[PDB]
A paper describes a structure:
[name] and H3 Affitins, which are derived from libraries with a longer and randomized loop 2, present a protruding convex region that penetrates the catalytic cleft of [name], thereby validating our strategy to use an extended randomized loop. In both cases, the Affitins bound the enzyme by inserting the protruding extended loop into the active site while the β-sheet 2 rested on the [name] surface. The structure of the [name]-[name] complex suggested that Lys29 was the main residue responsible for binding and activity inhibition. It formed a salt-bridge through its nitrogen NZ with Glu555 of [name], the residue that acts as a proton donor in catalysis. Other key interactions involved [name] residues Gln35, Arg50 and Arg46 (non-randomized position), which were hydrogen-bonded to residues Tyr455, Tyr551 and Pro539 of [name]. These latter interactions stabilized the complex by positioning the β-sheet 2 over the [name] surface. In addition, due to Tyr551, which is positioned at the external part of the active site, the interaction with Arg50 limited access to the substrate even more. Finally, Lys29 also formed H-bonds via the main chain with Glu353 and Tyr354, which fix the artificial loop into the enzyme cavity. We observed that among the residues of [name] interacting with Affitin [name] (Glu353, Tyr354, Val357, Tyr455, Trp538, Pro539, Tyr551, Glu555), three residues were not found in other glycosidases (Glu353, Val357, Trp538), while Pro539 was found in only three other glycosidases, suggesting a high specificity of [name]. Furthermore, all these residues are outside or at the edge of the [name] catalytic site, confirming that [name] can recognize residues surrounding a catalytic site.
Numbering used by the authors:
A (entry chain B): 2 to 39, 45 to 66
B (entry chain A): 42 to 575
The structure:
C-alpha cells in the first residue's frame, strides 16, 4: 500500500514494498513513525496505514 | 611570520564559534577540498601550520576535511585561514571561554519564568514582559470544583506557556546533577536574577523558582497523586504571556508525574538544606507523601488529559521514573527500604545506561545518583554492572563522535528534540570521567558542545543570541509577539530531523525550531562542567 507523507513542502507517496527501515519516536504529542525507502520520511502514528504499523511491529 | 594573503569568511569552514579550552581538542570541519591551514591571531601572526585530513561524513554523504589545531594552547583570539577556501569566524581560546554562554543559557531560564514580570538587557537589547498567569490554577478537572489552588511560578515549558511535570523531571534532574557534579564550580557563580543578593547560590535560586511550582502539584485530597500539568484547554496564540487570560487548570495525575515529583523534591531537600532548611523539610515531607502513594499503588497510570490539546509528555512507562525516585529518596535519606527498591529495579534493566535519553527515559539519572553516592551498603555486583555499562556507553559515544565528520556525539540519529540529547550526552561522559578519568570523555563532551555552536553542516549556532548566525525565528510566543527583531536569548532549538540538513529556522517549524526547558537544561549541564574550570 501507499504511505502519504510531506517532505521539503511537497506531498509525496511511497509504497511500503520500497520501505527499508521503520522505527518510532515518542514526541511531546505522540508517536512518530520514521522510515527510509529506496529517501527519508515520517508520519504520525495515527496517519500510518496498518501495513506500515505492521512493519514497525516486526522491526520491533 | 604573518599571513600575506587577505582571507574572507567562507561558510564551508565550520567550527565552534564560541571557542576552545587550553589542553583540550580543537577541530574544524572544512567542507571543501584543502590541505594546508593556519591558525592566525587577529593581527595576522601565524601561530600554527597544519594539514587537514580527509574524512567521509557518512551522515551528510560527503567528504570533509578535518583541521586539528588542538596543540594551539595560548589564550587569545584567533581565526583559521585555509588557502583556496577562506577563513573561519574568529574564536577564543580561554579557560573561561564557556562562562558567558553558561550565563546566557541560565538567562534563558530566568526569562522563561511564569507568574512574575521578567526583565533583562542582553547585548543592549531589553527583553521584558509583565506578570503572567497569576490565576494559576483551577481544580475543576480534578475534583469538579471551580476552586483556585495556587500553582503559580515555575518555568514556561517551551514555545508555549503551559507547565508540565514530566518534562520538568529531566530538566530539574539534569540541572540538580550539574549542581552536585560541579558544585565547587557553580556555587560562586552570580547570575542576572532578582535573587542575586540573597544568601542562596544564584544557580539554586533559579531552580527554586521551578521547585516552588512543582510543590503545588500534589492533589488537594492529600493522596499524594501529582497533577500532570497546568494548562489552558487549547494552545493560545502568538501573544505575550501577560495577555493570555484564558483559565488554566490542573490536569489529572499520572504515575510518572508522581514519581518525577518524588525524585525532584527528594533532590531539592538535600540540595537546599544548607541554605533554606525550612524549605528542605517541606520538600522531603512532600516527597514522602507521594512515595507512599507510589508504594501502595504500583501500576503505571497515564494522565487523563484528552480534554486538553496542549503538550502530552505521556511517557510510555513509569518504571524508569520510579527507579529514579527510589535512587533520590535513598541518596537523600539513606533508608534501606529505598536502597532495596532501587537495587531491585535496577538489576532488572538489561542495559543499565542508555546513550540516547530524555524526558521519556530518565533511569540514567538514578543510575548516576546511585553510582556516585558516598553512602555505604550498595551491592558490589550491581555497582560493577552499572559501572561497566556506563563506561561501555561512554566509550561508544567517544567512537561515534570521532567517526562523525562534525564530531556529533549522537551520530546519525535525528528526531524531534535531538539537539538537546546531543548535549545531554555530556552527562554520561562526565560521570564516566569521574569514575574512570579519561581525557577522551571530556574531549567528547566538548565535541557535543562544539557541534551545537557551529561545528555542524549548517555552520550555525543552535542557541539564540550566541555564536555564529544563531537561530532568529524560533517557534516561541514571546519572540513572535514582542517588538524586538532578535528572538529571546539563550535557547537551544530542538533541531532538524529526519535528516542532518532538515533544520529550518522559521517560526512555523515547531518540529525543528521550538525551544524547551529540557533542551536548555542539557545545554546548562554541558556548559556547567566548564565553568570555573581547571
Ligand atoms: Ca542568590
Ligand atoms: Ca518514563
Ligand atoms: Ca521578536
Ligand atoms: Zn506565565
Amino acid at each position: 500500500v501507499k504511505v502519504k507523507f510531506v517532505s521539503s513542502g511537497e506531498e509525496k507517496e511511497v509504497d511500503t514494498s520500497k520501505i527499508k527501515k521503520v522505527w518510532r519516536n515518542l514526541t511531546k504529542y505522540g508517536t512518530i513513525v520514521q522510515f527510509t525507502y529506496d529517501g527519508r520520511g515520517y508520519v504520525r502514528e495515527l496517519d500510518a496505514p496498518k501495513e506500515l504499523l505492521d512493519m514497525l511491529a516486526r522491526a520491533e | 611570520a604573518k599571513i600575506t594573503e587577505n582571507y574572507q569568511f567562507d561558510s564551508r569552514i565550520r567550527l565552534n564559534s564560541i571557542g576552545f579550552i587550553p589542553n583540550h581538542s580543537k577541530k574544524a570541519t572544512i567542507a571543501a577540498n584543502c590541505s594546508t591551514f593556519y591558525v592566525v591571531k587577529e593581527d595576522g601572526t601565524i601561530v600554527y601550520t597544519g594539514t587537514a585530513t580527509s574524512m567521509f561524513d557518512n551522515d551528510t554523504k560527503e567528504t570533509v576535511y578535518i583541521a586539528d589545531f588542538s596543540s594551539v594552547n595560548e589564550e587569545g583570539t584567533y581565526y583559521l585561514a585555509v588557502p583556496g577556501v577562506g577563513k573561519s569566524v574568529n574564536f577564543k581560546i580561554a579557560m573561561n571561554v564557556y562562562e558567558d554562554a553558561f550565563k546566557t543559557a541560565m538567562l534563558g531560564m530566568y526569562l522563561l519564568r511564569c507568574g512574575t514580570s521578567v526583565s533583562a538587557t542582553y547585548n543592549g537589547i531589553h527583553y521584558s514582559h509583565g506578570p503572567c498567569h497569576t490565576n494559576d490554577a483551577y481544580l475543576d478537572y480534578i475534583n469538579g470544583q471551580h476552586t483556585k489552588k495556587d500553582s503559580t511560578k515555575g518555568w514556561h515549558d517551551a514555545g508555549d506557556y503551559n507547565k508540565y511535570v514530566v518534562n520538568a523531571g529531566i530538566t530539574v534532574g539534569s540541572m540538580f546533577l550539574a549542581w552536585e557534579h560541579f558544585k565547587d564550580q557553580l556555587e560562586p557563580v552570580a547570575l542576572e536574577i532578582p535573587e542575586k543578593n540573597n544568601s542562596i547560590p544564584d544557580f539554586l535560586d533559579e531552580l527554586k523558582y521551578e521547585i516552588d511550582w512543582i510543590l503545588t502539584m500534589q492533589y488537594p485530597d492529600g493522596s499524594g497523586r501529582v497533577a500532570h500539568k497546568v494548562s489552558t484547554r487549547n494552545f493560545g496564540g502568538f501573544i505575550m504571556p501577560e495577555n493570555e487570560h484564558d483559565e488554566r487548570f490542573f490536569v489529572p495525575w499520572s504515575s510518572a508525574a508522581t514519581a518525577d515529583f518524588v525524585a525532584m523534591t527528594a533532590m531539592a531537600a538535600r540540595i537546599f538544606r544548607p541554605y533554606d532548611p525550612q524549605y528542605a523539610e517541606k520538600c522531603i515531607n512532600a516527597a514522602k507523601v507521594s512515595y507512599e502513594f507510589l508504594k501502595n499503588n504500583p501500576a503505571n497510570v497515564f494522565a487523563n488529559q484528552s480534554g486538553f490539546s496542549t503538550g502530552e509528555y505521556a511517557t510510555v512507562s513509569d518504571a524508569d521514573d520510579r527507579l529514579w525516585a527510589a535512587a533520590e529518596m535513598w541518596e537523600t535519606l539513606g533508608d534501606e527500604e529505598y536502597l532495596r527498591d532501587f537495587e531491585n529495579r535496577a538489576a532488572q534493566f538489561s542495559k543499565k545506561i542508555e546513550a540516547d535519553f530524555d524526558w521519556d527515559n530518565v533511569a540514567n539519572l538514578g543510575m548516576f545518583t546511585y553510582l556516585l553516592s558516598e553512602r555505604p551498603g550498595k551491592n558490589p555486583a550491581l555497582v560493577q554492572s552499572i559501572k561497566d555499562s556506563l563506561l561501555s556507553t561512554a566509550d561508544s559515544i567517544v567512537r561515534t563522535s570521532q567517526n562523525h565528520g562534525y564530531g556529533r556525539t549522537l551520530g546519525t540519529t535525528y528526531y524531534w528534540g535531538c539537539n538537546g540529547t546531543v548535549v545531554r550526552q555530556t552527562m554520561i561522559l562526565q560521570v564516566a570521567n569521574k569514575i574512570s578519568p579519561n581525557n577522551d570523555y571530556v574531549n567528547a563532551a566538548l565535541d557535543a558542545i562544539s557541534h551545537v555552536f557551529g561545528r555542524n553542516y549548517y555552520n550555525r549556532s543552535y542557541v539564540t543570541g550566541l555564536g555564529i548566525n544563531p537561530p532568529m525565528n524560533p517557534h516561541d510566543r514571546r519572540s513572535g509577539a514582542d517588538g524586538i527583531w532578535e528572538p529571546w536569548p539563550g535557547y537551544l532549538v530542538g533541531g532538524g530531523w529526519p535528516g542532518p540538513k532538515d533544520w529550518v529556522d522559521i517560526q512555523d517549524s515547531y518540529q525543528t525550531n521550538e525551544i524547551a526547558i529540557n533542551w536548555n537544561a542539557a545545554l546548562i549541564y554541558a556548559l556547567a562542567g566548564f565553568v570555573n574550570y581547571n
